[PDB]
Design an enzyme around this catalytic site. Sequence first.
Site: not given
Lengths: 394, 394
Positions: A8, A83, A172, A233, A378
């Site tokens: 990633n 990813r 996601h 956020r 993941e």
Amino acid sequence: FPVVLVINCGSSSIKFSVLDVATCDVLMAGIADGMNTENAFLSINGDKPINLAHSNYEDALKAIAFELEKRDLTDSVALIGHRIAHGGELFTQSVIITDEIIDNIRRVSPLAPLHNYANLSGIDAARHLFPAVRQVAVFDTSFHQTLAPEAYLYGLPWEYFSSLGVRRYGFHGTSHRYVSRRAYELLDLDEKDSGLIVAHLGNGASICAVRNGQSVDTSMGMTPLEGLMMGTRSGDVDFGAMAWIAKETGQTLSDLERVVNKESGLLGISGLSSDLRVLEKAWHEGHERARLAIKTFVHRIARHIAGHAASLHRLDGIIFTGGIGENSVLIRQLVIEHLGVLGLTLDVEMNKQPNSHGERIISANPSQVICAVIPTNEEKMIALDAIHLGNVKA
Amino acid sequence: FPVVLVINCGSSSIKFSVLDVATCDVLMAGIADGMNTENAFLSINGDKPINLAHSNYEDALKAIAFELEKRDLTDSVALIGHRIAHGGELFTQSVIITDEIIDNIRRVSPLAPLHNYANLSGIDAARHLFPAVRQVAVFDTSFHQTLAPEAYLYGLPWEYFSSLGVRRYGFHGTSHRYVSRRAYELLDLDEKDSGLIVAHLGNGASICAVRNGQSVDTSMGMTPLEGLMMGTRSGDVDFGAMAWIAKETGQTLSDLERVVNKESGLLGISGLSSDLRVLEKAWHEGHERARLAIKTFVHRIARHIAGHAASLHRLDGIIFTGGIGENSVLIRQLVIEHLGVLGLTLDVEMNKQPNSHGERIISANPSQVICAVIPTNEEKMIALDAIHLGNVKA
Ligand SMILES: Nc1nc2c(ncn2[C@@H]2O[C@H](COP(=O)(O)OP(=O)(O)OP(=O)(O)O)[C@@H](O)[C@H]2O)c(=O)[nH]1
Ligand SMILES: Nc1nc2c(ncn2[C@@H]2O[C@H](COP(=O)(O)OP(=O)(O)OP(=O)(O)O)[C@@H](O)[C@H]2O)c(=O)[nH]1
């Protein structure tokens, strides 16, 4: 005994993991932080943190590759998983990386300028250091490509969708997909006749409605800024309010973009932290703004869960996942209690159990909808895609 | 036989109605359009449209007042009701207009620069022309003041709420309140133990969760731009997308504000009309983009209805209202079918009935939640507030 190298490659770091092909267990993990700055350091699964002065993505991945040599794992790397943050409309599934795929990632890269160009740098690096190795691209957006136009169109002029590609993409996707599959087993559901709501809750947070195996609605939008309120956020925010602030404070869109992305959310309201553990203790210690931040957080999650339920024909399960969804006894309690309208009943002894208990049902028997916690993996989902694509003749 | 003069003094027009105090029936209605421009015209309930060259709010209300003289209604005006768009945090109910109230409206006026300064002009005008008459201010925001902080806070830095007043206010409060009261009668519900969702659907569209008589959640935000997709308004829109468009097209926030307010929504997607009647015929005639506009419209309504249900302890009723909610057999059908997850069953023969059938239940017996259409009467609700405040000794 072959292995998969999962990468990633973020804007400021490179998260990596090495998983065994046979069992999908993690054998090695780590991170190369402070990327592109004078101080860049490699850290391996908690061990000694090495350093590298002003190192780019290529040399940082080479440093990781040196450590694979040291532990005699280089010769065993049969597959590499990448990813990718944004796959536009082009990617509906995981692909074997070729010249075509690279071009296509570059084509959709303007949709995520921060995330994607770092992903491409990671691809080039891994291609250089491992040319004889099959490499796979797994996209954060791809699972949500089953969304109907009614679910992905914004209420903007058509031109923005048709010529510019402005639409809901959602993120996601890897997690939502992984957790979905696990839920059919745990809840003993038929995939083709099921309705699930997955609440991926971490520093970044999103909701997904999975109807009959397919994503039919998701809370994030074109960017990871829409939907739930998150760590830093803001989430859903009235554009009229955003325009009003612009005139009143004398701030530009790029100023507000910084505020909405890095100074808002749980951090913004509390004025203390984006971390829930700090905020949970703060509320226990009588901090009012920490209570409000968490309550607003909970309220917006309940609202989106219940909202995404509309895209299902029947609601069989609600699944919590991510750093927060797996570890927060309080947040899960508060969200489920906020959704009593749907007929949810929580089992508190089962909800008290820590994440060490893994895949667990947290709802009581008289409940109309089964609630569960499924630890997201993941890296495993990326590995499983890579292993599958490892049998493919190109 | 006293009467009430209701005034909605908008930015481009002045909507007025004269209601009998005893029965609350409309005796006279009209509109003074093209306000402040060279061409300003007075029209009375479909009759002869008179004209006035470059007329301001004061003289236009005087023209209306001349017509009240002509029909011998001036001497009978016992009360005047004013619709105010924004009441900030100061107004939780309808008030008798005094010097204090005027100041307070001026204080919160920066929150709605278009709407409120036109409302004040209408107040001054009516005060000039009718000084001996009790005058009442009814606010679009006031019904939503029972919202908890978790429900009205944005995920922005605390400073924006505390010092600037950035928070959810919500609108259609008069309508949501009026329709709520009527629903307790129609559905034979106890007000103090009830959960309602009101879907006010017109050119402007909003959802409201009414728990135990009080508004606990609403779809509009600080401005009427948030929530549902509307006629020309976009609704919920990813700010990340809005910032992306700003860089890519080279547009300012004020340019995008125009686009999001007047060029978006049903108009934006279809590229044809903001009017549903035109779009419904267009879809019937095989227009694809009109089908998409309506489907997106329906999807976003279902999502917000189901979302606002979370703020209720128990869902007893879903109520449709407004120009669209009262007259659209199709939209109601499509929304209710989109909410099968909640256990809704529609009676199509009852849903086929036109608005002439007034307050009507449209759901079948086996349905878990009662669905109904209640024609909204904002003028009656303003009059009823005025009549109540007419017994008050100041
Ligand atoms: N209450 C509680 N919160 C925890 C605990 N452990 C981690 N968290 C929270 O989980 C959050 C981090 O979760 P992650 O899933 O790792 O976040 P992330 O990976 O950066 O974000 P995403 O990639 O979008 O999922 C932090 O904000 C922590 O507050 C815990 O033991 N208890
Ligand atoms: N399908 C259908 N739609 C109708 C009909 N009559 C009116 N409408 C729709 O209703 C809308 C106007 O409703 P209104 O309530 O008057 O809108 P508004 O008063 O300007 O907006 P608000 O004050 O926010 O409620 C238009 O977009 C029409 O398309 C009808 O008979 N059938």
